Write a protein that binds this ligand. Structure first.
Ligand code: CDL
Ligand code: CDL
Ligand code: PC7
Ligand code: PC7
Ligand code: PTY
Ligand code: PTY
Ligand code: PTY
Lengths: 536, 97, 47, 438, 155, 77, 111, 82
C-alpha cells in the first residue's frame, strides 16, 4: 500500500514519456491526473496511519544496492511522521498541477513529455522524502535536480531558458558535492548510512558546515539563490512545483531529518536570506519573479527558526507544509493571469471581468502570505516570529522581513485587481475549464483543512511573551500592507536599482569567478597542452 | 513544393494543432508528435489503465509481504483490513485494544 | 575438477621452471683462452 | 578458460579461410561465440577458488594464463563490446586489423607473465599506427604520438621485467616476489602512467580518439585504457607495494592534478570526440588513485568504475560516430536543434551524458561512491578534493548539451534501424548495472 | 628475534609435508580455510604455500566479518524501530556491539595507507581523556573539549 | 557547397537591424588579476584543509607543552 | 530533382547515372561556413601562436606548478596526520629524509 | 579552398636563404680520413686517461653536444674571407 504512490507516479512518467504516441494528448490528460488521484488516496492512507495513529513502516525493496566490502547500503523506504506529511503535501500539490497542465499546456507541442516529466519529478521527490538511508535520499535529490534541468530548459530555442537550466544544474552539483562529503563522514564514524544509527550527539564542525552548504543549494539561501530567480524561464506548472514543494523544501527537510546543524550559522543565514528576498521582491516587476523572491524569504524564515528552540524543526516543517499550498496557488493563478493578459509585467495588469474562483484563490493565498490572522500561514509564521524573540538579532531581521513581505504582497494584489486596466485594446482570452476549477478547489481545500488540523503540535502552545510583543507581527504586516496599497516610495533610487540587480551576486560571479574559471582553462589548454607540449 | 509521395502515409494536422504552426511530419518521437490525438487513442488508454492496475496489484502484494510494523499503532489503522502482521493497537495510556 | 590439485601442479611447474632457469644462468666463460676458469672441462685442442 | 583462449585464437584464424565476401558475417558470429565462451569461463569460475578462479599453462611460464576478479571483469567487458565494433567496420583490411588488435588485447588481460603480457599488448603497435593513420580520414601525427608513447613506456616496463627475471629467476605473477627497488618500481609505473592517461603523459589519447574510426575509438576507450588496471592489480601492486606507499603523496599530486587539468582542458573543446576523450582522462585518475590505496575498497571500486566507464564512454563515442555519419561534422557550433531533429538520438545522448556525470540510476554512481569511500578511508581531504572539482565536468557537459539542444536547423539527422541495434545492448547493460547488478 | 638458515630450511620442509597432507584428500573448500598455518617467518612471501593459504584464510575471515556486521545492523534497526522514543536508552548495547563489529571488519585489513576507522569516536574520546588528565595534573589549560559520556548512539 | 553568407533582412523592420555590434574584445582576464583571484578563491574552496591544519597544529602544540611540563615535573620529582 | 535511394524491400540499387539527385546519407549533411572552418583550424593549431613571455611563464608557474605544490603539501600533511593517527612510526617517504625504515605496517603487529 | 598554415617570410627571400646551401661540396673522405686517424690514436690514448667522476663525464658530454656544429651549418655560413 505504501509503495503504490511511487509506482503510480513512475507509471505515469513511463506511460506518457515512452508510449505517448499511442496514448495521445488526451491519453496523457487522463492517465496523468487519474494516476496522481490514486496516489493521493494512497498518500492519505499513509498520512492517517503514520501521523495520526503513530505507526511507522519500513519497506525494504531489495538488499545490497551497493555491497563493496564493509560499505553496504539497501533500497529501503521508511515512512516516519515527517515523511508522511511531506508525501501528502507533495502528492496533493502535484495532482493539482497535473489537473492544471491539461488546459495550460494544450498549446504546447509536447504535452505528453511534459506530463511524464512532472510525474517522474513527483516520484523522485517521494523517493527523497521516504528514504530510510542517506543513499536513497541522494538518489531522490539528484533525480529532482535532473528533472528540474529537463523542465526549466523545456523551451530549447530560447538561450535564456537553457542557460537557466545550466545554472540550476551547476549550483545543485556544488551543493550535492558538499552533501556527499557529509554522507561519507557520517558513514565512516557511525558505521551506517541509515538515519537510526546516524545519530550523533556531538559532531565535528566540518560535518555540520558540509551539511549546511549542501542544504543551502536546493533550499536557495544566500550565495546559492541565483538559480531560483532564473528558474522563471520554465513553464508555469514547473515553477509551482519547484518553488512550492520539490526543490526548495528539500534542504529544510534534510536539515530537519538530521539535526547536525549549528544554531549560529542557520539563524544568521536564514534571517539574511529572508531580508534579502523581501528586498529583491520589492524591486521586481514580473509577477512570477516577485513570488520567487517571496519563496526565498519564506525559506529564510524556516531556516532561521531552527536556531530558536528545540521545537524549531517542527515549526520549520509546519511552515514548509503550509507554505507549499498558498505558494502553489499563487503560481497557478499568476500563470493563468499571464495567459489571459498575454503579459508578464505588473504595470499592464488591471481590473477586468474574470472567474470568481481564481480571484478568490489569489486573494486568500496572498492573505496567507501576508500573515492575515486566523489563517494557516498566520499560525505557522507567528510560531516562528514569536519563538525567535530570544534571538534578538534574528527576530529584528524577521520583523523587517515581515514588513517587506506585506508591502510587496499588497502591491501585487493592488496591481492585479484594484488598479485600473493597464493592458492594450486587443482580443486576449483564456477560458478556464472545469479541470482548472477542480485544481483550485483542491488548493482551497488544502488551505481550509490546514486551519482545522494545524501544522505543528506546539503551534498553539503558549510562548510566554507580553501581549504587545506577541501581537507585534500583525501590526508590522498591517503597516506594510497599508504602505503597499498607497504604493509609496520606501527606498532611494540607488537602493531600488541595487535591489533590482538582486545584490549583484551574479555580476560578481560573471566578472571574477567565471573569468578566472576560463583563464584557468586557458592556462591548462592553450598555454600548456596545446602550447608548450605541442610539437610544431 | 509538390509534396513527396510518402506524405500520404504521414498523418494530418490534429485539431489541437494551431493552423499557423508548421512542423515536419516525418520526424518520429517516442513521446508523440507535435499534437498527437491518434485514431484509437481510447483503446490504448484502456489498455494502459489495465496494465497500471495489474502492476498495482503486483506492487501491493510485494509491499504487503515486505511491510514490517515493529511498533503497535496507537489506534486502528486501515492496513489491518488487508495485512495481518499489524501489531495489536496500544493507546497512549498503554491499554491494549 | 580438483582445483587444489590443479593449483599445486601449476605452481610446481612454475617453480621447476624457475629452478631450471637459475641453473641455466650459472655460466662461466667458455673462452678457449680461459683454461683457468674451465680447468676441469674435458677438451682437446687441434692447433 | 581453455575454450575462451581457443576462440580468441580462432577469430583471426577464420579470416584467412573466409570467402572475403562472408567476412563480416563470419566475424560477427565469431565475436558472439567468443562472448559465449567468456560466459562459459565465468560459469566454470568458482568463487570458492579465492586467489585465482582458473589457471592454465600450455608448456611454459609465458603460456600461463589465468583469470581473477579484475581479469574476469575486463575480459567480459571486451568480449561484450567487440561485436559492436565488428558491425561498425567495413572491409577486409579493417576487419583484419581490428580482429588482430582484439585478439592481442584479450590475450593480454588473462596473461600471468609480465613478458608475455608485454609481448601480446605491444603486438598491437603498428596496427594502431596504420589504423589511426589511414589514408583519407586519419592523421599521421596522432599515430606517431600513440606509437612513440606506447613504445617508450612499454620498453621501461620490459626493462623492469628483465631485472625481475634476472633477480628472482621468474617474472610470473603466481610466484610471490617482493622488491623495494625504486628504479624497477618506476619502470613498471611508467607504463601505467602513460597507458592510463595521466597528466602530463595524456597527450596521445585525444589525437588518437579523434582520428581513429568509431570502432577503433570504442575499443580504445572501452578496454585499452583498462589494461592499466590489469597491470596494476596483477603486475605492480603484488610486487611494488612498498614503492606505492613510499610515493603516495606524489601519486596523489599527479592523480589530482590530472583530474583538475583534464577537466579544465575539456572546457576548451569544440569537437565532440575530443570532449568525450578528455572526459575519459579525468575519469581515469580516480581509478588509479583508488587502486593505489591498496585496500579492499579501492581495488573493487576501481574495477567497478572501469566497468562503468567501459559501458558509458563507448556509448558516447558510438552516438557521436552516428551523428558524424548523419551530418559530416563534429563541431558543436554547427550542430543545433538536435532535440527536435533527432528525438531518439537525443534521448540516448542525454541518457549517456547523465551516466558520464555519475547520476544515481547509472553504474558510475555506485562505482564513484565506492572509490570516494576508499579515498575517505585514506583521508577526508582526499575525497573532498575529488568531490568538489567534479563540478567542472558538469559545466562543460551542460554547455555542450545546451549548445546542441536548441536552435534552427533544416536537416533531419536521426538514427536508422542499424544504429539503434548498435546501442541497444549498451543501454540495457547500463540499466542492469545501474540497478546494482554490477 | 633471529632466524638461522637451518631453521628456515626446516620450516620449508615441514610446509612441504603440510602441502602433501592436504593433497592426499580432495577438498572443495581448500581455498576457504578455517585455520591458518602458524609461522614465525619474517616475510610470509618466503614460503609460498603459507602465503596463499593464510591469504585465503584472511579472505574467509573478512567475508564472515562483513556478513556479521550486516546482521548486527539488522538487529540494531529492529530495536530502534520497536522501542520508539525509548530507543536511545534501550538500543545503547546493540549499537555498541554493531559499532564494534564495524571497527573489526574495517580495521583488520585497512591497508598500508588507510587510517583506523573511528566508529563511535572512541579513539578521539580516549585522546581527550588522556589530554584532560594530563592538563589537570600538570596545571595546564586544555584548549580541547573534555571527554563525553556518550558521543554516538552506542559508543 | 558552402552556406550562403548573405543574411535575411525580412524581419529587420519587425525586430530591428543587425547593424549594432558587440563591444567586447573577446580577451581574457589579465595575468595579474588572475593571480590574485586564483590565490583567493582556491583557498576558499579548500576550507577543510585549513581547518584540519589548524586543529592538528593545536593538538601537536598542546601535546608538546604537556610533554615539556611532564619533563619538568619528572625532573625535580 | 531528388529521389529515394533506400529500398526496404531489399531491391536497392545506386543510380549513379540517374538525372535526379539521390536522397542518400549526404542529403542531411550540414552546409558549413568558410570562417568557421578557419576558426577551427586556428584553434587546433594554437601552438603556432605560442610565445614564451614572462607573462606566459608567470601564468604557467602560478597556476599549474602552484596547484602541484599545494597538492603535494596537503598530501604530505595528511600522511603525517595519518601516521600520528594510526600510531605508526614516521614513515620513510621518498623525498622526506627520515632515519627510520618504516614503510609498510606489519599486519601481525599490534600498533 | 582549405584553411592552411601561414608561412612566415616572403617567397623569394626564403628561396634566397635556401639557395645559400648550393655551394661547392667537398667530398666526405677528407673529413673521414682525419677522423679515422685521430680516432685510432685517440682510442689508444683513452686507455691512459685518468678515471673521471660520472658527473664530470656527463657534463663534458653535454658541453660537447652543445658545442658540436652540424656540417650543414658550416656549409651554409662558410665565407672564403678573412
Ligand atoms: C610546472 C611549472 C610550469 C611549467 C612551465 C614553466 C616554464 C618552463 C621552463 C622550461 C622551458 O622554457 O621549456 C621550453 C623549452 C622548449 O623550447 P621552445 O622555446 O619552446 O622551442 C624550442 C623548440 O624548437 C620547440 O619546437 P617544437 O614546437 O617542435 O617542440 C615542442 C616541444 C617543446 O617541449 C620541449 O622541448 C620539452 C617538453 C618537456 C619539458 C621538460 C620539463 C621542463 C619544465 C619542467 C620544469 C619547469 C619548472 C620551471 O613540445 C613537445 O612536443 C614535447 C612534449 C611531449 C612530451 C611531454 C612530456 C611532458 C614532461 C614534463 C611536462 C612539463 C611540465 C608541465 C606539466 C607538469 C606535469 C607533471 O623546453 C626545454 O628546453 C626543456 C628544458 C628542461 C629540459 C629538462 C632537462 C633536460 C635534461 C638534459 C640533460 C643533459 C644530458 C647530457 C647528455 C647529453 C648528450 C646526449
Ligand atoms: C680534424 C678532424 C676533425 C674532427 C676532430 C676530431 C677528430 C676525432 C677525434 C676522436 C673521435 C672520437 C671521439 C669523438 C666523438 C665520437 C663521434 C664520432 O667520432 O663519430 C664520427 C663522426 C662522423 O660520423 P658521421 O656518421 O659522418 O656523422 C653522423 C652525424 O649525422 C653527422 O651529421 P650532422 O653533423 O649534420 O648531425 C649531427 C647530429 C648527430 O647526432 C650526434 O651528434 C649524436 C651525439 C649524441 C651524444 C653521443 C654520445 C655521448 C656519449 C659520450 C660518452 C662519453 C661520456 C660518458 C658519459 C656520458 C653520458 C651521456 O647531432 C645534431 O644534430 C646536433 C646536436 C649534437 C648533439 C645532439 C645531442 C644534444 C643534447 C643536448 C641537449 C640540450 C638541448 C636542450 C634544449 C633543447 C630545446 C628543445 O665524427 C665526428 O663527429 C667527430 C667530431 C668530434 C667533435 C665531438 C665534440 C665532442 C666530443 C665528445 C663529446 C661527446 C658528445 C658527442 C657530440 C657529437 C659527436 C658527434
Ligand atoms: C527510481 C525507480 C524508477 C525509475 C523511473 C525513472 C523515471 C523515468 C525514467 C525513464 C528513463 C530515464 C532516462 C530517459 C532518457 C533521458 C532523456 C530524457 O529524459 O528526455 C529526452 C527525451 O525524452 C524521452 O523521449 C524519454 C523520456 C521518457 C520519460 C523521462 C522521465 C524523466 C527522466 C527521469 C530522470 C532520470 C533520473 C536519472 C537520475 C536519477 C530529452 O528531453 P529534452 O532534452 O528536454 O528535449 C525534449 C524536447 N523538448 C525541447 C520539447 C522538451
Ligand atoms: C524504451 C524503454 C521503455 C520501457 C520502460 C521500462 C520501464 C522500467 C520500469 C522501471 C522499473 C523500476 C523498478 C525499480 C526496482 C528495481 C528492480 C530490482 O532491482 O529487482 C529486485 C527486486 O526488488 C523489487 O522488485 C523492487 C520492487 C519494484 C516495485 C516497488 C514499487 C515501485 C516504485 C519504484 C520505486 C523504486 C525505487 C528504488 C530506487 C533504487 C531484485 O531483487 P534481488 O533478488 O534482491 O536482487 C539483488 C539486488 N541487486 C539488484 C542490487 C543485485
Ligand atoms: C644518458 C642520456 C641522457 C639524456 C639524453 C637525452 C637525449 C634526448 C632523448 C630523447 C628521447 C625521446 C625520443 C622521443 C623524441 C621525440 C619525438 C621526435 C619528434 C618528432 O619530430 O617526431 C615526429 C612525430 O613524433 C610525434 O609526433 C611524437 C610527439 C612527441 C612524443 C612524446 C615523447 C614520448 C613521451 C616522452 C616521455 C615519456 C616518459 C619518459 C620516461 C616525426 O618525425 P618524422 O618521422 O617526420 O622525421 C622527420 C625528422 N624531423
Ligand atoms: C620529482 C617528482 C618525482 C616524479 C615522480 C612522481 C610520482 C612517481 C612515483 C612512482 C611510484 C613508484 C616509483 C618509485 C620511485 C620513482 C620516483 C620517486 C621519487 C624519487 O625520485 O625519489 C628518488 C629515489 O628514487 C630513485 O632513486 C629512482 C627514481 C626513478 C628513476 C627514474 C628513471 C628510472 C627508469 C628505470 C627503468 C627501469 C629500470 C629497472 C632496472 C630520490 O629520493 P630519495 O630517497 O633519494 O630522497 C632524497 C631527498 N632528499
Ligand atoms: C616553478 C613552479 C612553482 C612556482 C610557483 C609556486 C607557487 C606556489 C607556492 C604556494 C602553493 C600553495 C601553498 C602550499 C605550499 C606551502 C609551503 C609548503 C610548506 C608546507 O608544507 O607547509 C604546509 C602548508 O599547508 C598545507 O598543507 C597546504 C595549504 C595550501 C593548500 C590549500 C590551498 C589551495 C587549495 C586548492 C586545492 C589544492 C589542494 C587540494 C588537496 C603547512 O605546514 P605543516 O603543518 O603541514 O608542516 C610541514 C612542514 N613544512
Amino acid at each position: 500500500m505504501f509503495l503504490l504512490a511511487v509506482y503510480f507516479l513512475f507509471f505515469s512518467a513511463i506511460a506518457n514519456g515512452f508510449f505517448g504516441r499511442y496514448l495521445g494528448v488526451r491519453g496523457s490528460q487522463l492517465l496523468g491526473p487519474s494516476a496522481l488521484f490514486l496516489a493521493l488516496l494512497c498518500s492519505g492512507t499513509i498520512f492517517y496511519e503514520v501521523c495520526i495513529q503513530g505507526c511507522s513502516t519500513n519497506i525494504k525493496l531489495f538488499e545490497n544496492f551497493v555491497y563493496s566490502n564493509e560499505l553496504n547500503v539497501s533500497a529501503s523506504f521508511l515512512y516516519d511522521p515527517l515523511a508522511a506529511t511531506m508525501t501528502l503535501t507533495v502528492v496533493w500539490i502535484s495532482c493539482a498541477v497535473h489537473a492544471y497542465q491539461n488546459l495550460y499546456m494544450r498549446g504546447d507541442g509536447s504535452q505528453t513529455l511534459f506530463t511524464s516529466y512532472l510525474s517522474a519529478f513527483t516520484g523522485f521527490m517521494l523517493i527523497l522524502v521516504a528514504g530510510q538511508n542517506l543513499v536513497m535520499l541522494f538518489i531522490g535529490w539528484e533525480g529532482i535536480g535532473v528533472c528540474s534541468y529537463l523542465l526549466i530548459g523545456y523551451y530549447g530555442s530560447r538561450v535564456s531558458a537553457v542557460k537557466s537550466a545550466n545554472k540550476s544544474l551547476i549550483v545543485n552539483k556544488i551543493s550535492d558535492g558538499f552533501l556527499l562529503g557529509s554522507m561519507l563522514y557520517l558513514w565512516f564514524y557511525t558505521g551506517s548510512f541509515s538515519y537510526c544509527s546516524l545519530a550523533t550527539f556531538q559532531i565535528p564542525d566540518v560535518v555540520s558546515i558540509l551539511v549546511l552548504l549542501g542544504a543551502i543549494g536546493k533550499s536557495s539561501q544566500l550565495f546559492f539563490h541565483v538559480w531560483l530567480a532564473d528558474a522563471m524561464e520554465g513553464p508555469t506548472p514547473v515553477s509551482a512545483l519547484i518553488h512550492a514543494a520539490t526543490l526548495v523544501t528539500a534542504g529544510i527537510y534534510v536539515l530537519c531529518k538530521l539535526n547536525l546543524h549549528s544554531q549560529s550559522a542557520v539563524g544568521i543565514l536564514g534571517a539574511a536570506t529572508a531580508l534579502m528576498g523581501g528586498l529583491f521582491g520589492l524591486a521586481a516587476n514580473d509577477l512570477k519573479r516577485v513570488i520567487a523572491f517571496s519563496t526565498c524569504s519564506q525559506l529564510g524564515y524556516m531556516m532561521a527558526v531552527l536556531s530558536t528552540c528545540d521545537d524549531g524543526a517542527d515549526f520549520a516543517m509546519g511552515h514548509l507544509v503550509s507554505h507549499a499550498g498558498f505558494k502553489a496557488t499563487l503560481f497557478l493563478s499568476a500563470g493563468l493571469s499571464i495567459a489571459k493578459e498575454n503579459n508578464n509585467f505588473l504595470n499592464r495588469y488591471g481590473s477586468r471581468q474574470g472567474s470568481p474562483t481564481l480571484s478568490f484563490a489569489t486573494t486568500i493565498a496572498s492573505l496567507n502570505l501576508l500573515g492575515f490572522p486566523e489563517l494557516g500561514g498566520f499560525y505557522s509564521k507567528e510560531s516562528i516570529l514569536n519563538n525567535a524573540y530570544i534571538n534578538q538579532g534574528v527576530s529584528i531581521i524577521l520583523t523587517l522581513a515581515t514588513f517587506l513581505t506585506a508591502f510587496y504582497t499588497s502591491k501585487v494584489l493592488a496591481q492585479l485587481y484594484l488598479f485600473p486596466y493597464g493592458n492594450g485594446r486587443q482580443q486576449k482570452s483564456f477560458d478556464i475549464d472545469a479541470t482548472t476549477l477542480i485544481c483550485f478547489g483542491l488548493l482551497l481545500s488544502e488551505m481550509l483543512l490546514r486551519i482545522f488540523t494545524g501544522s505543528s503540535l506546539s503551534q498553539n502552545m503558549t510562548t510566554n511573551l507580553p501581549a504587545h510583543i506577541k501581537n507585534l507581527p500583525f501590526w508590522v504586516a498591517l503597516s506594510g500592507a497599508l504602505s503597499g496599497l498607497a504604493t509609496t516610495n520606501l527606498f532611494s533610487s540607488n537602493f531600488m536599482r541595487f535591489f533590482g540587480n538582486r545584490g549583484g551576486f551574479d555580476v560578481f560571479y560573471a566578472r571574477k569567478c567565471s573569468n578566472v574559471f576560463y583563464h584557468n582553462a586557458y592556462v591548462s589548454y592553450t598555454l600548456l597542452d596545446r602550447g608548450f607540449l605541442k610539437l610544431y | 513544393v509538390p509534396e513527396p509521395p510518402y506524405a500520404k502515409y504521414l498523418a494530418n494536422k490534429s485539431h489541437y494543432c494551431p493552423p499557423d504552426f508548421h512542423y515536419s511530419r516525418e520526424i518520429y518521437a517516442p513521446y508523440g508528435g507535435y499534437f498527437n490525438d491518434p485514431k484509437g487513442w481510447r483503446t490504448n488508454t484502456a489498455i494502459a489503465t489495465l496494465v497500471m492496475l495489474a502492476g498495482a496489484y503486483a506492487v501491493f502484494c510485494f509491499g504487503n509481504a515486505r511491510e514490517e510494523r515493529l511498533r503497535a499503532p496507537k489506534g486502528w489503522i486501515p492496513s489491518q483490513l488487508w495485512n495481518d502482521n499489524v501489531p495489536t493497537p496500544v493507546d497512549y495510556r498503554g491499554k491494549v485494544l | 575438477v580438483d582445483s587444489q590439485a590443479e593449483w599445486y601442479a601449476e605452481y610446481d611447474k612454475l617453480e621447476k621452471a624457475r629452478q631450471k632457469r637459475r641453473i641455466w644462468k650459472w655460466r662461466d666463460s667458455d673462452s678457449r683462452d680461459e683454461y683457468a676458469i674451465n680447468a676441469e672441462e674435458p677438451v682437446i685442442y687441434i692447433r | 578458460m581453455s575454450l575462451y583462449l581457443f576462440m580468441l585464437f580462432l577469430q583471426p584464424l577464420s579470416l584467412s579461410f573466409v570467402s572475403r565476401s562472408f567476412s563480416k558475417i563470419s566475424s560477427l558470429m565469431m565475436s558472439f561465440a567468443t562472448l559465449w565462451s567468456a560466459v562459459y569461463m565465468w560459469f566454470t569460475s568458482n568463487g570458492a577458488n579465492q586467489t585465482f578462479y582458473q589457471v592454465v599453462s600450455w608448456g611454459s611460464d609465458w603460456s600461463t594464463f589465468g583469470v581473477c576478479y579484475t581479469s574476469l571483469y575486463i575480459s567480459l567487458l571486451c568480449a561484450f563490446i567487440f561485436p559492436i565494433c565488428v558491425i561498425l567496420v567495413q572491409g577486409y583490411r579493417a576487419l583484419s586489423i581490428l580482429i588482430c588488435i582484439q585478439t592481442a588485447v584479450s590475450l593480454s588481460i588473462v596473461s600471468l607473465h609480465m613478458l608475455a603480457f608485454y609481448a601480446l599488448f605491444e603486438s598491437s603497435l603498428l596496427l594502431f599506427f596504420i589504423l589511426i593513420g589511414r589514408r583519407k580520414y586519419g592523421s599521421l601525427s596522432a599515430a606517431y604520438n600513440i606509437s612513440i608513447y606506447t613504445f617508450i613506456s612499454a620498453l621501461g616496463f620490459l626493462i623492469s621485467a628483465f631485472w625481475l627475471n634476472w633477480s628472482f629467476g621468474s617474472v610470473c605473477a603466481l610466484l610471490p616476489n617482493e622488491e623495494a627497488n625504486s628504479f624497477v618500481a618506476f619502470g613498471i609505473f611508467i607504463l601505467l602512467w602513460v597507458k592510463a592517461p595521466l597528466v602530463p603523459f595524456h597527450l596521445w589519447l585525444p589525437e588518437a580518439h579523434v582520428y581513429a574510426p568509431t570502432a577503433g575509438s570504442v575499443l580504445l576507450a572501452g578496454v585499452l585504457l583498462k589494461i592499466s588496471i590489469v597491470g596494476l592489480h596483477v603486475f605492480f601492486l603484488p610486487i611494488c607495494a612498498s614503492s606505492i606507499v613510499k610515493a603516495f603523496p606524489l601519486i596523489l599530486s599527479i592523480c589530482l592534478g590530472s583530474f583538475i587539468f583534464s577537466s579544465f582542458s575539456t572546457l576548451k573543446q569544440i569537437d565532440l570526440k575530443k570532449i568525450v576523450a578528455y572526459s575519459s582522462i579525468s575519469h581515469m585518475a580516480i581509478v588509479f588513485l583508488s587502486s593505489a590505496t591498496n585496500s579492499g575498497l579501492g581495488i573493487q571500486g576501481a574495477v567497478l568504475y572501469c566497468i562503468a566507464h567501459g559501458l558509458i564512454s563507448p556509448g558516447l563515442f558510438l552516438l557521436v560516430g552516428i551523428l558524424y555519419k548523419n551530418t559530416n561534422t563534429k563541431l558543436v557550433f554547427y550542430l543545433r536543434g538536435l532535440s527536435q531533429q533527432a528525438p531518439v538520438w537525443w534521448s540516448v545522448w542525454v541518457f549517456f551524458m547523465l551516466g558520464n556525470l555519475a547520476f544515481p540510476l547509472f553504474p558510475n554512481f555506485i562505482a564513484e561512491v565506492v572509490c570516494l569511500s576508499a579515498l575517505f578511508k585514506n583521508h577526508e581531504l582526499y575525497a573532498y578534493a575529488f568531490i568538489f572539482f567534479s563540478f567542472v565536468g558538469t559545466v562543460y557537459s551542460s554547455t555542450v548539451l545546451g549548445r546542441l539542444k536548441g536552435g534552427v536547423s533544416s536537416q533531419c539527422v536521426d538514427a536508422s534501424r542499424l544504429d539503434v541495434i548498435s546501442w541497444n545492448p549498451l543501454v540495457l547493460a547500463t540499466v542492469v548495472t545501474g540497478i546494482g547488478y554490477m | 628475534t633471529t632466524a638461522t638458515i637451518e631453521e628456515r630450511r626446516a620450516f620449508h620442509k615441514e610446509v612441504l609435508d603440510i602441502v602433501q597432507s592436504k593433497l592426499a584428500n580432495k577438498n572443495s573448500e581448500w581455498a576457504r580455510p578455517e585455520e591458518p598455518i602458524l609461522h614465525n617467518l619474517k616475510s610470509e612471501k618466503e614460503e609460498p604455500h603459507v602465503y596463499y593459504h593464510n591469504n585465503n584464510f584472511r579472505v574467509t575471515r573478512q567475508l564472515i566479518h562483513f556478513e556479521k556486521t550486516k546482521i548486527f545492523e539488522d538487529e540494531l534497526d529492529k530495536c530502534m524501530r520497536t522501542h520508539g522514543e525509548a530507543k536511545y536508552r534501550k538500543c545503547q548495547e546493540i549499537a555498541k556491539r554493531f559499532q564494534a563489529s564495524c571497527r573489526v571488519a574495517s580495521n583488520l585489513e585497512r591497508g598500508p595507507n588507510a587510517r583506523k576507522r573511528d566508529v563511535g569516536f572512541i579513539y578521539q574520546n580516549n585522546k581527550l581523556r588522556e589530554l584532560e588528565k594530563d592538563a589537570k595534573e600538570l596545571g595546564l589549560n586544555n584548549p580541547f573539549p573534555p571527554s563525553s559520556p556518550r558521543t554516538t548512539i552506542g559508543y | 557547397n558552402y552556406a550562403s553568407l548573405k543574411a535575411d533582412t525580412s524581419m529587420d523592420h519587425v525586430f530591428g537591424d543587425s547593424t549594432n555590434k558587440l563591444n567586447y574584445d573577446f580577451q581574457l582576464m589579465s595575468s595579474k588579476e588572475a593571480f590574485f583571484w586564483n590565490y583567493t578563491l582556491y583557498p576558499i574552496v579548500g576550507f577543510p584543509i585549513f581547518l584540519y591544519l589548524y586543529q592538528f597544529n593545536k593538538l601537536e602544540n598542546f601535546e608538546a607543552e604537556i610533554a615539556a611540563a611532564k619533563a619538568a615535573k619528572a625532573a625535580s620529582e | 530533382s531528388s529521389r529515394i535511394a533506400g529500398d526496404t524491400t531489399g531491391k536497392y540499387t545506386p543510380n549513379i547515372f540517374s538525372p535526379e539527385t539521390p536522397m542518400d546519407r549526404s542529403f542531411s549533411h550540414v552546409p558549413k561556413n568558410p570562417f568557421w572552418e578557419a576558426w577551427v583550424f586556428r584553434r587546433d593549431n594554437i601552438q603556432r601562436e605560442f610565445v614564451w613571455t614572462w607573462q606566459t611563464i608567470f601564468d604557467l608557474a602560478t597556476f599549474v606548478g602552484g596547484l602541484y605544490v599545494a597538492m603535494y603539501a596537503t598530501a604530505s600533511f595528511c600522511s603525517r596526520q595519518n601516521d600520528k593517527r594510526n600510531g605508526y612510526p614516521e614513515r620513510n617517504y621518498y623525498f622526506s629524509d627520515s632515519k627510520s625504515n618504516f614503510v609498510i605496517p606489519d599486519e601481525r603487529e599490534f600498533y | 579552398d582549405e584553411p592552411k598554415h601561414q608561412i612566415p617570410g616572403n617567397a623569394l627571400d626564403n628561396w634566397a636563404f635556401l639557395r645559400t646551401y648550393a655551394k661547392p661540396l667537398p667530398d666526405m673522405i677528407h673529413y673521414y680520413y682525419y677522423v679515422y686517424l685521430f680516432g685510432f690514436f685517440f682510442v689508444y690514448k683513452v686507455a691512459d686517461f685518468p678515471e673521471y667522476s660520472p658527473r664530470v663525464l656527463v657534463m663534458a658530454a653535454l658541453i660537447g653536444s652543445l658545442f658540436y656544429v652540424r656540417r650543414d651549418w658550416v656549409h651554409r655560413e662558410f665565407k672564403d674571407s678573412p
